[PDB]
């Protein structure tokens, strides 16, 4: 937890551009890995999405928050619901042409039940 | 339930004290569960409110990006991605005592070593883009705080469940076990004392009969 | 010498139980827990013990059976499953790991398919030495195969998904038949290990 | 008249102790918890008491306080630390205040720097009245100063990482070669207390 200070992002063009503009993006020089990846609904495969999810959630001890577009999150709602750990915190946010559905967010859905 | 065949009397005191103490601990865990439930509830309403904030924030960020794109003409993604290296904006994990529960909260960190974005060949419009960046800086950052409130809420639920589990164990389990142990020990001890008292009663009766034989001997001597 | 003691309420504090346990080199205890449920013969794994078990192991080695090994392994599995029962009753069944769950499932398998034998049945009424030895051996083989399969990175539940056949087969070893057909049982165990290999092949993939 | 009953297992149900209770003018209890834990000589916190304490205080009126009247204060600290630790065991190091942390560290210090006496050790073989009063005064000083510092707005962690010598010095204040070097130890301790700030 204490090691978790970096933010990873999986989202569409506009979101990625905005977030990277804010200055949240960072590239580890040694590993040459990035903390941002532009996503496309048509082009990015579900397997790569699940892979990135599992890697960012469990393979890295330095991830604090994972950002994800609602449109993107819907495609892996299963894996999202399957994630129950407190860290990283799960927050579903809207994207361009894809407004935020409350019930679509797996964590927020979980919270909704038993209200 | 649970019964121990061999008991002293000190063991009864230890079991009774452990029982009352676990009862008080049960009460503490119960009130703590009540407060943690209220807190997690407020954090839940705040979480839904934060999601409904989050969507609007996303729309706003998208709008800012669109405005910057219109202003620039330029291909924003290329330069932006190229100018990423180390985080100017990082986070800091902190520990905060909140109504008893210790929670991890996130604090936004701004590295002063890292400079702001300076687009070249954009000119005045670049400054407009800077403003757009500010918006994002102002926005998702707060959202991250809300995200912390989400994670901490989730854990607050899980831990609350743990407390409830303790309440489940301190209710019909520990209390009943202690009750059965105390009862069986009480029965064994009282029965043993009854047996010893029977031996003593027989001894006293033996002394009384021997004394009566002494009296009979005295009467015989008198006769 | 076989002597029945009838203490009041089954308490070991009774003079009978103590005086009996004192001069005895072996003691077989009777529990009222499984007897009240009309379950088969009830004996406490946390109580019943024998001091003649060593020379008994030396004597069972004459038939080249493993008395001591199977008994100690099953007793350890029983104790670990009992502690696992205390932990599950404490927190829950979701607080354990795959190995502990395998130990609990194996405990249940050993409870239903081994220690419990119907005396009114035409089969379980009498269990031969070779039958119980082969049963404990096949049980240990299935346990080792499951433990090895769990170490291959497979879940206990996922392993228990395709193992239903071997489970029903392990539970069906109580009936069997007369002295003839022991080979069918040992062979069925071999078919069980082979089934485990087939499951391993199925996993990949 | 010095009498010692031999209760089995440390039970208070001892008929020896039961009959000796309605007579003896002073009773020093030995806790079975502290004895079997491989800790220095056992003394029960709440059970140990003396009815001659008032007359002994009247006799200490000539010898003055420290720790005649400071005995009631040390009793307050130990009893409150017992009531605090009773909950702390059922709570943990998770949820607590600053005064609570000061109280727990005060219990640990009162345990290490006061009650502990080693008869086998040449240096710890015995301690003077003035020496024990010096260690107790040192503890009461570090404690009252910690409580005062907590009311000044200072945290527990920074204060704990600030002085690591003060603990080792407050703990060794039990003679160890009495009574001539008393005033000097009082001076070094008071000087450290004034240098803490």
XYZ file of C-alpha atoms in Angstrom:
740
model
C 0.000 0.000 0.000
C 2.707 2.467 1.054
C 4.576 1.611 -2.147
C 1.519 2.522 -4.218
C 2.056 6.068 -5.492
C 1.665 5.769 -9.274
C -1.553 5.910 -11.302
C -2.278 3.537 -14.196
C -4.919 4.308 -16.826
C -6.958 2.373 -19.376
C -9.269 4.688 -21.330
C -10.212 6.162 -24.717
C -8.360 8.874 -26.666
C -9.921 11.968 -25.079
C -9.653 10.655 -21.516
C -6.052 9.487 -21.999
C -5.095 12.839 -23.514
C -6.742 14.802 -20.701
C -5.287 12.705 -17.892
C -1.809 12.690 -19.431
C -2.153 16.458 -19.897
C -2.933 16.812 -16.188
C 0.485 15.276 -15.555
C -0.549 11.932 -14.101
C 1.410 9.995 -16.716
C 4.834 8.537 -15.963
C 7.286 6.239 -17.743
C 9.685 4.087 -15.729
C 13.059 4.636 -17.473
C 14.547 1.310 -16.351
C 11.610 -0.923 -17.273
C 10.603 1.278 -20.234
C 7.011 0.559 -19.179
C 4.383 3.298 -19.152
C 1.554 4.192 -16.782
C -0.764 5.168 -19.630
C -2.159 3.361 -22.667
C -4.660 4.726 -25.177
C -7.566 2.332 -25.698
C -9.945 1.705 -28.588
C -13.258 -0.143 -28.280
C -13.009 -1.749 -31.717
C -9.292 -2.501 -31.844
C -8.258 -3.539 -28.330
C -9.015 -7.204 -27.622
C -10.767 -8.387 -24.447
C -7.844 -10.690 -23.638
C -5.431 -7.756 -23.624
C -7.846 -5.830 -21.405
C -8.051 -8.681 -18.896
C -4.271 -9.117 -19.111
C -3.655 -5.426 -18.421
C -6.187 -5.525 -15.582
C -4.575 -8.527 -13.867
C -1.065 -7.126 -14.394
C -1.922 -3.677 -13.021
C -3.883 -5.139 -10.105
C -1.666 -8.002 -8.925
C 1.656 -8.041 -10.804
C 2.628 -4.534 -9.675
C 3.140 -3.507 -6.048
C 3.362 0.171 -6.991
C -0.104 0.781 -8.463
C -2.308 3.046 -6.333
C -5.234 3.901 -8.612
C -6.421 2.377 -11.890
C -8.556 4.622 -14.100
C -10.971 3.052 -16.576
C -13.559 4.312 -19.055
C -17.117 3.117 -18.385
C -17.423 1.915 -21.988
C -14.197 -0.036 -21.514
C -15.167 -1.252 -18.030
C -18.404 -2.766 -19.348
C -16.397 -5.118 -21.588
C -14.652 -6.584 -18.539
C -17.422 -6.095 -15.976
C -16.846 -9.730 -14.963
C -13.187 -9.175 -14.058
C -14.108 -5.845 -12.453
C -16.734 -7.420 -10.191
C -14.254 -10.221 -9.494
C -11.854 -7.641 -8.052
C -12.696 -7.189 -4.368
C -9.383 -5.917 -3.000
C -9.316 -2.431 -1.474
C -6.234 -1.587 -3.532
C -6.191 -0.396 -6.190
C -9.419 1.563 -5.658
C -11.928 1.056 -8.463
C -13.599 4.100 -10.014
C -15.625 3.898 -13.231
C -15.661 7.142 -15.214
C -17.347 8.124 -18.513
C -15.700 8.528 -21.912
C -16.457 10.329 -25.173
C -19.714 9.099 -26.775
C -20.179 6.877 -23.714
C -21.771 8.559 -20.658
C -21.287 7.078 -17.183
C -23.779 4.381 -16.217
C -23.942 3.938 -12.406
C -25.117 0.315 -12.563
C -22.346 -0.487 -15.055
C -19.640 0.131 -12.456
C -18.959 -3.252 -10.858
C -17.745 -1.902 -7.511
C -20.537 0.693 -7.380
C -22.978 -2.075 -8.299
C -21.669 -4.118 -5.371
C -22.169 -1.101 -3.102
C -25.654 -0.539 -4.545
C -26.814 -3.982 -3.419
C -27.882 -4.065 0.261
C -27.745 -0.227 0.060
C -21.361 -28.028 24.299
C -17.922 -28.208 25.926
C -17.360 -29.980 29.247
C -14.120 -30.496 31.181
C -14.021 -33.561 33.443
C -11.342 -32.317 35.851
C -11.885 -28.915 37.512
C -10.492 -27.174 40.588
C -12.283 -23.936 41.496
C -9.668 -21.462 40.311
C -10.421 -22.714 36.797
C -14.034 -21.657 37.404
C -12.840 -18.143 38.215
C -10.645 -17.994 35.108
C -13.481 -19.209 32.895
C -15.976 -16.806 34.524
C -13.620 -13.842 34.160
C -12.781 -14.793 30.568
C -16.530 -15.054 29.882
C -17.474 -11.677 31.324
C -14.463 -10.105 29.599
C -15.295 -11.653 26.242
C -18.846 -10.382 26.810
C -17.588 -6.824 27.309
C -15.368 -7.292 24.259
C -18.470 -8.408 22.378
C -20.258 -5.214 23.398
C -17.266 -3.139 22.265
C -17.141 -4.957 18.920
C -20.897 -4.409 18.567
C -20.841 -0.650 19.158
C -17.771 -0.495 16.904
C -19.759 -2.360 14.254
C -22.573 0.181 14.641
C -20.259 3.166 14.173
C -18.365 1.491 11.315
C -21.707 0.735 9.657
C -22.837 4.358 9.936
C -19.481 5.598 8.625
C -19.488 3.117 5.741
C -23.056 4.213 4.966
C -22.086 7.887 4.774
C -19.070 6.850 2.709
C -21.454 4.904 0.466
C -23.781 7.842 -0.187
C -20.648 9.913 -0.721
C -19.406 7.213 -3.120
C -22.543 7.313 -5.268
C -22.432 11.109 -5.168
C -18.779 10.838 -6.191
C -19.622 8.588 -9.154
C -22.290 11.017 -10.343
C -19.689 13.751 -9.909
C -17.186 11.585 -11.783
C -19.295 11.332 -14.926
C -19.757 15.097 -15.155
C -16.038 15.529 -14.498
C -15.257 13.137 -17.361
C -17.564 15.091 -19.660
C -15.829 18.327 -18.635
C -12.345 16.881 -19.204
C -13.422 15.598 -22.611
C -14.789 19.058 -23.422
C -11.516 20.705 -22.373
C -9.577 18.264 -24.541
C -11.881 19.055 -27.467
C -11.425 22.802 -26.958
C -7.649 22.389 -26.840
C -7.755 20.234 -29.982
C -9.829 22.849 -31.816
C -7.468 25.599 -30.659
C -4.291 23.751 -31.625
C -5.002 21.844 -34.834
C -1.745 20.097 -33.991
C -1.718 16.423 -32.983
C -1.977 16.565 -29.197
C -1.487 12.864 -28.450
C 1.941 12.622 -30.082
C 3.529 15.572 -28.257
C 1.752 14.734 -24.992
C 2.833 11.082 -24.976
C 6.330 12.147 -26.033
C 6.557 14.584 -23.116
C 5.682 11.917 -20.545
C 8.642 10.707 -18.474
C 8.370 10.948 -14.691
C 5.262 11.944 -12.752
C 4.997 15.622 -11.904
C 1.753 14.569 -10.243
C 2.259 11.614 -7.905
C 0.427 10.325 -4.840
C 1.267 9.767 -1.185
C -0.226 7.062 1.016
C -1.090 8.246 4.524
C -2.577 6.716 7.671
C -5.578 8.391 9.287
C -7.476 7.359 12.411
C -11.171 7.687 11.582
C -13.772 6.864 14.233
C -11.587 4.036 15.508
C -10.778 2.452 12.164
C -7.317 3.187 10.768
C -7.617 3.976 7.076
C -5.241 4.606 4.202
C -5.927 7.937 2.486
C -4.307 9.404 -0.627
C -2.654 12.816 -0.874
C -1.898 14.536 -4.182
C 1.785 15.349 -4.677
C 3.158 17.977 -7.048
C 6.834 17.603 -7.933
C 8.354 21.087 -8.283
C 11.365 19.612 -10.087
C 9.111 18.723 -13.024
C 7.986 21.720 -15.084
C 4.571 22.332 -16.663
C 3.830 21.612 -20.326
C 5.298 24.028 -22.873
C 3.899 23.378 -26.351
C 6.003 24.853 -29.159
C 4.502 26.093 -32.409
C 1.159 26.429 -30.656
C 1.763 29.911 -29.278
C -1.130 31.730 -27.622
C -3.515 28.818 -28.115
C -1.019 26.690 -26.225
C -1.812 28.783 -23.175
C -5.484 27.968 -23.672
C -4.470 24.316 -23.690
C -2.607 24.937 -20.438
C -5.889 26.138 -18.972
C -7.552 22.944 -20.164
C -4.835 20.983 -18.389
C -5.586 22.980 -15.243
C -9.186 21.803 -15.465
C -8.080 18.177 -15.532
C -5.637 18.936 -12.720
C -8.486 20.450 -10.724
C -10.835 17.588 -11.503
C -9.615 13.995 -11.509
C -7.369 14.767 -8.559
C -10.396 15.312 -6.322
C -11.865 12.202 -7.909
C -8.833 10.256 -6.709
C -9.643 11.377 -3.178
C -13.167 10.105 -3.681
C -11.653 6.867 -4.966
C -9.801 6.576 -1.677
C -13.117 7.088 0.100
C -14.428 4.223 -2.026
C -11.622 1.790 -1.241
C -11.668 2.680 2.437
C -15.437 2.187 2.379
C -15.063 -1.288 0.888
C -12.526 -2.308 3.497
C -14.732 -0.631 6.112
C -17.421 -3.079 5.057
C -15.122 -6.101 5.103
C -13.725 -5.255 8.524
C -17.258 -4.514 9.723
C -18.133 -8.018 8.627
C -15.183 -9.287 10.652
C -16.547 -7.487 13.690
C -19.964 -8.989 13.036
C -18.327 -12.405 12.817
C -16.829 -11.837 16.253
C -20.294 -10.885 17.458
C -21.513 -14.175 15.981
C -18.840 -16.056 17.917
C -19.330 -14.103 21.129
C -23.084 -14.685 21.034
C -24.203 -18.307 20.883
C -20.710 -19.789 20.728
C -18.272 -18.429 23.297
C -20.949 -17.421 25.790
C -22.712 -20.814 25.649
C -19.404 -22.704 25.831
C -18.365 -20.737 28.908
C -21.824 -21.304 30.417
C -21.645 -25.075 29.887
C -18.057 -25.194 31.187
C -19.001 -23.216 34.308
C -22.102 -25.343 34.898
C -20.323 -28.699 34.485
C -17.413 -27.511 36.641
C -19.908 -26.290 39.262
C -21.674 -29.664 39.241
C -18.405 -31.628 39.478
C -17.073 -29.426 42.286
C -20.342 -29.402 44.256
C -20.621 -33.179 43.851
C -17.030 -33.700 45.027
C -17.723 -31.453 48.016
C -20.858 -33.523 48.634
C -18.809 -36.739 48.627
C -16.202 -35.272 50.964
C -19.025 -33.993 53.190
C -20.459 -37.511 53.177
C -17.084 -38.900 54.299
C -16.967 -36.263 57.045
C -20.547 -37.041 58.082
C -19.653 -40.731 58.310
C -16.536 -39.858 60.316
C -18.513 -37.686 62.748
C -21.120 -40.431 62.996
C -18.295 -42.885 63.749
C -17.028 -40.618 66.520
C -20.574 -40.305 67.883
C -21.061 -44.089 67.854
C -17.670 -44.688 69.472
C -18.602 -42.076 72.074
C -21.919 -43.866 72.610
C -19.931 -47.060 73.141
C -17.807 -45.192 75.679
C -21.011 -44.083 77.413
C -22.335 -47.647 77.375
C -19.038 -48.782 78.899
C -19.346 -46.124 81.613
C -22.899 -47.245 82.389
C -21.713 -50.860 82.505
C -18.927 -49.874 84.905
C -21.485 -48.046 87.046
C -23.705 -51.139 87.110
C -9.675 -59.088 28.284
C -12.577 -56.967 27.028
C -14.464 -55.058 29.714
C -17.269 -52.545 29.258
C -17.429 -49.558 31.602
C -20.665 -47.576 31.897
C -19.832 -44.216 33.497
C -22.680 -41.791 34.237
C -23.178 -39.462 31.289
C -20.019 -40.755 29.610
C -17.754 -38.640 31.807
C -14.099 -39.611 32.227
C -14.232 -38.155 35.742
C -16.144 -41.256 36.843
C -14.145 -43.709 39.012
C -14.792 -46.393 36.402
C -13.119 -44.508 33.556
C -10.046 -43.580 35.605
C -9.537 -46.999 37.200
C -9.978 -48.619 33.785
C -7.624 -46.239 31.959
C -4.975 -46.749 34.635
C -4.281 -50.472 34.236
C -5.051 -50.639 30.508
C -2.435 -50.852 27.765
C -5.179 -50.156 25.228
C -8.483 -48.256 25.301
C -11.241 -47.914 22.699
C -13.636 -45.078 23.522
C -17.305 -44.739 22.588
C -18.883 -41.388 21.690
C -22.574 -40.463 21.979
C -22.329 -37.788 19.273
C -22.626 -39.979 16.167
C -24.588 -42.593 18.101
C -27.386 -40.114 18.810
C -27.603 -39.292 15.106
C -28.078 -42.986 14.285
C -24.750 -42.818 12.446
C -22.395 -45.812 12.414
C -19.997 -46.842 15.233
C -18.697 -43.778 17.055
C -15.098 -43.486 18.219
C -13.220 -40.325 19.182
C -10.068 -39.690 17.144
C -9.035 -37.200 19.818
C -9.497 -39.735 22.627
C -9.070 -43.414 21.693
C -5.430 -44.547 21.747
C -3.387 -47.728 22.243
C 0.045 -48.378 23.764
C 0.228 -51.723 21.969
C 0.109 -49.936 18.604
C 3.893 -50.226 18.124
C 4.172 -54.017 18.327
C 0.925 -54.022 16.338
C 2.727 -52.090 13.605
C 5.573 -54.592 13.824
C 2.991 -57.391 13.469
C 1.140 -55.731 10.587
C 4.489 -55.440 8.823
C 4.389 -59.227 8.580
C 1.657 -58.803 5.971
C 3.768 -55.953 4.581
C 0.875 -53.556 5.263
C 1.477 -50.018 6.499
C -0.446 -49.673 9.755
C 1.656 -46.911 11.405
C 2.064 -44.778 8.272
C -1.582 -44.780 7.181
C -2.781 -44.362 10.770
C -0.432 -41.458 11.507
C -1.217 -39.772 8.181
C -4.962 -40.151 8.691
C -4.674 -39.015 12.327
C -2.670 -35.969 11.284
C -5.231 -35.261 8.560
C -7.931 -35.648 11.205
C -6.242 -33.291 13.664
C -5.458 -30.696 10.984
C -9.047 -30.955 9.731
C -10.298 -30.576 13.317
C -8.235 -27.419 13.757
C -9.532 -26.370 10.333
C -13.012 -26.983 11.746
C -12.234 -24.742 14.708
C -10.987 -22.032 12.329
C -13.929 -22.371 9.935
C -16.335 -22.264 12.870
C -14.359 -19.257 14.118
C -14.148 -17.083 11.004
C -15.567 -18.921 8.009
C -15.025 -21.316 5.120
C -13.882 -18.468 2.880
C -10.950 -17.671 5.175
C -9.042 -20.877 4.374
C -6.738 -22.016 1.557
C -6.970 -24.811 -1.033
C -4.880 -27.279 1.007
C -6.942 -26.855 4.187
C -10.127 -27.293 2.155
C -8.639 -30.438 0.648
C -7.934 -31.586 4.213
C -11.545 -30.939 5.218
C -12.923 -32.709 2.133
C -10.573 -35.624 2.812
C -11.760 -35.601 6.417
C -15.365 -35.877 5.247
C -14.385 -38.632 2.812
C -12.660 -40.524 5.625
C -15.697 -39.989 7.857
C -18.377 -41.178 5.423
C -16.475 -43.807 3.427
C -14.116 -45.307 6.040
C -14.779 -45.019 9.796
C -18.516 -45.449 9.265
C -19.520 -48.998 8.338
C -23.050 -50.390 8.661
C -23.199 -53.504 10.825
C -26.664 -54.310 9.525
C -25.340 -54.182 5.957
C -24.461 -57.305 3.968
C -21.057 -55.811 3.178
C -19.841 -53.212 5.685
C -20.747 -55.504 8.608
C -17.289 -57.088 8.447
C -14.170 -55.501 6.958
C -11.171 -57.757 6.146
C -7.556 -56.717 6.736
C -6.794 -56.522 3.013
C -9.972 -54.520 2.362
C -9.197 -51.814 4.925
C -5.517 -51.764 3.944
C -6.369 -51.354 0.256
C -8.963 -48.712 1.138
C -6.501 -46.690 3.224
C -3.850 -47.115 0.528
C -6.169 -45.959 -2.270
C -7.321 -43.086 -0.070
C -3.705 -42.081 0.551
C -3.020 -42.366 -3.185
C -5.972 -40.139 -4.076
C -4.878 -37.715 -1.336
C -1.309 -37.576 -2.627
C -2.561 -37.177 -6.212
C -4.881 -34.344 -5.175
C -2.141 -32.684 -3.111
C 0.235 -32.954 -6.071
C -2.434 -31.621 -8.434
C -3.060 -28.671 -6.119
C 0.675 -27.949 -6.211
C 0.456 -27.785 -10.000
C -1.528 -24.559 -9.651
C -5.025 -26.023 -9.861
C -7.802 -25.037 -7.454
C -9.247 -27.623 -5.060
C -12.755 -26.987 -6.400
C -11.643 -27.119 -10.039
C -9.872 -30.370 -9.203
C -13.056 -31.577 -7.511
C -15.048 -30.751 -10.647
C -13.859 -33.678 -12.789
C -13.020 -35.924 -9.825
C -16.642 -36.855 -9.109
C -16.095 -40.270 -10.676
C -13.134 -41.081 -8.425
C -15.137 -39.763 -5.468
C -18.145 -41.985 -6.150
C -15.694 -44.845 -6.712
C -13.971 -44.165 -3.389
C -17.357 -44.085 -1.675
C -18.352 -47.338 -3.399
C -15.484 -49.341 -1.890
C -17.596 -50.128 1.181
C -19.811 -52.677 -0.567
C -17.320 -54.644 -2.674
C -17.670 -58.429 -2.459
C -16.240 -61.653 -0.934
C -12.520 -62.548 -0.781
C -12.519 -62.736 -4.585
C -12.081 -59.495 -6.518
C -9.467 -57.633 -4.472
C -7.639 -57.190 -7.770
C -10.662 -55.306 -9.103
C -10.326 -52.861 -6.198
C -6.567 -52.316 -6.484
C -7.081 -52.005 -10.232
C -9.859 -49.495 -9.599
C -7.316 -47.489 -7.597
C -4.911 -47.683 -10.535
C -7.774 -46.460 -12.718
C -8.176 -43.622 -10.208
C -4.544 -42.523 -10.536
C -4.922 -42.860 -14.305
C -8.067 -40.734 -14.052
C -5.964 -38.148 -12.218
C -3.492 -38.219 -15.111
C -6.386 -37.770 -17.550
C -7.599 -34.782 -15.532
C -4.082 -33.347 -15.651
C -4.170 -33.745 -19.434
C -7.586 -32.055 -19.486
C -6.258 -29.060 -17.540
C -3.619 -28.491 -20.242
C -6.034 -27.608 -21.744
C 6.703 -11.910 62.243
C 7.426 -12.847 58.623
C 5.242 -15.695 57.353
C 5.005 -17.304 53.911
C 2.153 -19.638 52.970
C 2.657 -22.156 50.169
C -0.492 -22.027 48.000
C -0.540 -24.607 45.191
C -0.486 -23.193 41.663
C -0.903 -19.638 42.911
C -4.606 -20.009 43.682
C -6.254 -17.535 46.067
C -8.398 -20.414 47.310
C -5.564 -21.446 49.623
C -6.941 -22.281 53.118
C -3.530 -21.229 54.397
C -3.959 -17.874 52.697
C -7.680 -17.881 53.559
C -7.030 -18.168 57.306
C -3.939 -15.933 57.155
C -5.982 -13.185 55.486
C -8.133 -12.327 58.513
C -5.085 -11.822 60.735
C -1.892 -10.487 59.116
C -1.277 -6.737 59.170
C 0.596 -6.754 55.841
C 0.151 -8.925 52.747
C 2.427 -8.873 49.692
C 0.958 -10.884 46.830
C 2.863 -12.791 44.157
C 1.227 -12.958 40.722
C 1.387 -16.356 39.025
C 1.315 -14.491 35.712
C 4.549 -12.593 36.382
C 6.357 -15.535 37.998
C 5.881 -18.149 35.242
C 6.570 -15.642 32.443
C 10.267 -15.662 33.405
C 9.863 -12.117 34.727
C 11.506 -10.612 37.820
C 9.876 -11.311 41.248
C 6.091 -11.384 41.104
C 3.856 -8.712 42.620
C 0.111 -8.465 42.010
C -0.896 -4.935 41.015
C -4.356 -4.568 42.601
C -4.118 -7.209 45.344
C -1.006 -6.004 47.177
C -1.842 -3.487 49.913
C -0.845 -2.401 53.427
C -2.996 -1.126 56.302
C 0.136 0.193 58.001
C 0.716 2.489 55.015
C -0.896 5.411 56.880
C 1.300 4.999 59.960
C 4.296 4.367 57.696
C 3.442 7.622 55.932
C 3.259 9.338 59.317
C 6.752 7.967 59.957
C 7.719 9.108 56.466
C 6.515 12.612 57.352
C 9.957 13.131 58.873
C 11.663 11.512 55.876
C 9.349 13.505 53.577
C 7.644 12.501 50.267
C 9.304 10.909 47.205
C 7.893 8.511 47.241
C 5.696 8.555 50.395
C 2.896 10.584 48.811
C 4.123 9.648 45.336
C 3.155 6.065 46.131
C -0.512 6.970 45.704
C 0.416 8.611 42.396
C 2.410 5.600 41.186
C -0.553 3.482 42.291
C -2.794 5.703 40.182
C -0.466 5.272 37.201
C -0.234 1.487 37.550
C -3.951 0.948 38.255
C -5.019 3.221 35.399
C -2.441 1.474 33.195
C -4.069 -1.813 34.194
C -7.546 -0.526 33.336
C -6.084 0.775 30.065
C -4.205 -2.411 29.167
C -7.300 -4.486 29.970
C -9.034 -2.739 27.076
C -5.849 -2.505 24.983
C -5.628 -6.300 24.938
C -9.200 -6.378 23.606
C -8.506 -3.436 21.286
C -4.925 -3.589 20.048
C -2.385 -1.053 18.819
C -4.846 0.093 16.154
C -7.177 2.547 17.904
C -5.723 4.585 20.764
C -5.062 8.151 21.925
C -1.792 9.888 22.829
C -2.391 9.764 26.597
C -3.030 6.059 26.097
C 0.306 5.543 24.302
C 2.011 7.485 27.069
C 0.194 5.287 29.604
C 1.210 1.994 27.945
C 4.832 3.065 27.550
C 4.540 4.202 31.201
C 3.395 0.728 32.218
C 6.275 -0.883 30.310
C 8.719 1.573 31.882
C 7.278 1.099 35.384
C 7.804 -2.619 34.759
C 11.368 -2.431 33.423
C 12.721 0.450 35.509
C 11.050 -0.117 38.897
C 9.562 -3.485 39.894
C 12.350 -5.558 38.336
C 15.057 -6.596 40.804
C 17.667 -9.320 40.253
C 19.056 -10.981 43.378
C 21.573 -13.057 41.428
C 23.181 -9.997 39.827
C 25.846 -8.251 41.903
C 24.775 -4.755 40.851
C 21.032 -5.411 41.066
C 21.293 -7.472 44.274
C 19.628 -4.711 46.290
C 18.425 -1.125 45.949
C 18.372 1.732 48.502
C 15.209 3.495 49.659
C 16.586 6.737 48.242
C 17.701 4.958 45.059
C 14.292 3.414 44.391
C 12.753 6.780 45.229
C 15.144 8.236 42.637
C 14.112 5.817 39.891
C 10.435 6.316 40.787
C 10.912 10.083 40.753
C 12.643 9.767 37.367
C 9.691 7.807 36.027
C 7.183 10.276 37.511
C 9.177 13.079 35.896
C 9.418 11.548 32.415
C 5.719 10.644 32.649
C 4.431 13.987 33.940
C 6.628 15.674 31.307
C 5.207 13.432 28.579
C 1.667 14.249 29.740
C 2.548 17.945 29.773
C 4.109 17.649 26.307
C 0.937 15.991 25.023
C -1.001 19.052 26.208
C 1.482 21.252 24.350
C 0.452 19.784 21.003
C 3.355 17.384 20.499
C 2.862 13.974 18.875
C 3.858 10.582 20.286
C 6.106 9.362 17.457
C 8.381 12.404 17.155
C 8.699 12.570 20.941
C 9.558 8.866 21.041
C 12.208 9.212 18.334
C 13.537 12.375 19.992
C 15.119 10.957 23.163
C 16.452 7.400 23.250
C 18.907 8.047 26.069
C 16.313 9.209 28.618
C 14.758 5.739 28.809
C 18.047 3.883 29.293
C 18.987 6.468 31.931
C 15.653 6.345 33.774
C 15.878 2.539 33.810
C 19.375 2.344 35.342
C 18.523 4.764 38.163
C 18.237 1.872 40.623
C 21.404 1.479 42.717
C 23.866 -0.051 41.798
C 26.206 1.459 44.424
C 24.202 3.615 46.918
C 23.873 6.013 48.595
C 26.720 8.502 48.089
C 26.170 9.044 44.362
C 22.487 9.916 44.773
C 22.440 13.703 44.415
C 24.701 13.411 41.350
C 22.293 11.066 39.562
C 19.493 13.441 40.558
C 21.465 16.252 38.941
C 22.204 14.379 35.712
C 18.577 13.281 35.436
C 17.182 16.749 36.183
C 19.704 18.196 33.722
C 18.502 15.781 31.048
C 14.883 16.669 31.874
C 15.682 20.363 31.449
C 17.684 19.668 28.277
C 14.771 17.789 26.707
C 12.529 20.834 26.171
